[PDB]
Structure 1
Amino acid sequence: TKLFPKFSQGLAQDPSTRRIWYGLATAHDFESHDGMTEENLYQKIFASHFGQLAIIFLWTSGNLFHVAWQGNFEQWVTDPIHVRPIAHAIWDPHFGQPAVEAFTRGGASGPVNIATSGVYQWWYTIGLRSNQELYVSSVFLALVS
């Protein structure tokens, strides 16, 4: 008898490798969990929705932080039609010398990745101009997360 499927006592009695896969797969199937009522199920879903909200806000805060750190948002503001957006810098130790040289796009120094997520146009449209404001947005979104 194991204890990894704490939600499913029958799954913990499984002595095979199927227990791991089924416990991972039936992780948020609260309606089939052992000894669980309706009210606790609803409260668990409420907490899970809060968790997904926190994850979403953390992810967009990270997008703001990485754009403000390693992007070319000021250069994109000065010239949107010419300068390409930059998502995040590339630090891969398995990269070769030509590989570093082939990813310094957008007028950057190190290896960077060109952003095609559309956040540069969106943030230029809503009045965000400097990376200071993107940094403040990132820390505020981390705070609300």
Structure 2
Amino acid sequence: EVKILVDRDPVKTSFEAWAKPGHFSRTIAKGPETTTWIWNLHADAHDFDSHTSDLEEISRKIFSAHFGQLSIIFLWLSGMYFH
């Protein structure tokens, strides 16, 4: 029962979500009406539990964020070894 359960190509790699700030939630993607929105955009950025109610997407985002953190740590270690 413990197998490799993996779905192929769930998210399309594109810069469309880069061009729209705050795409992850609904109350924020409508656009800024006040300056507070900007702060909100940096407050709910990594709150994956509030973006979606599905545990699968949250877990996948967690896994890839961990990978990015490991990449940053390896970059920092490379910098220390170079210096």
TM-score, length basis structure 1? 0.41
Match of 1:27 among 45, 48, 62: 45
Matches within 5 A, 1:79-98: none
Amino acid at match of 2:69: Q
Unaligned runs of 5+ in 1: 67-145
Taking the aligned partners of 1:12 and 1:19, their CA distance within structure 2 comes to 10
Matches within 5 A, 1:1-145: 3-13=20-30, 14-33=32-51, 35-66=52-83
CA RMSD of aligned residues (A): 1.3
Identity of aligned residues (%): 49
- Residue pair 1:12, 1:19 contacting (<8 A) in 2 also: no
Shift of 1:36: 4.7
Amino acid at match of 1:12: A
Q: Deviations along 1:31-62, whole A, 9 cap, x unmatched?
A: 011x4511011011000001100100100100
Taking the aligned partners of 2:71 and 2:45, their CA distance within structure 1 comes to 19
Runs of 4+ in 1 over 6 A off after TM superposition: none
Aligned to 1:135: none
Larger Rg over CA atoms = 1
Amino acid at match of 2:25: S
Taking the aligned partners of 1:60 and 1:38, their CA distance within structure 2 comes to 33
Shift of 1:9: 1.5
Shift of 1:12: 2.8
Aligned to 1:85: none
Q: Secondary structure at the match of 1:56?
A: helix
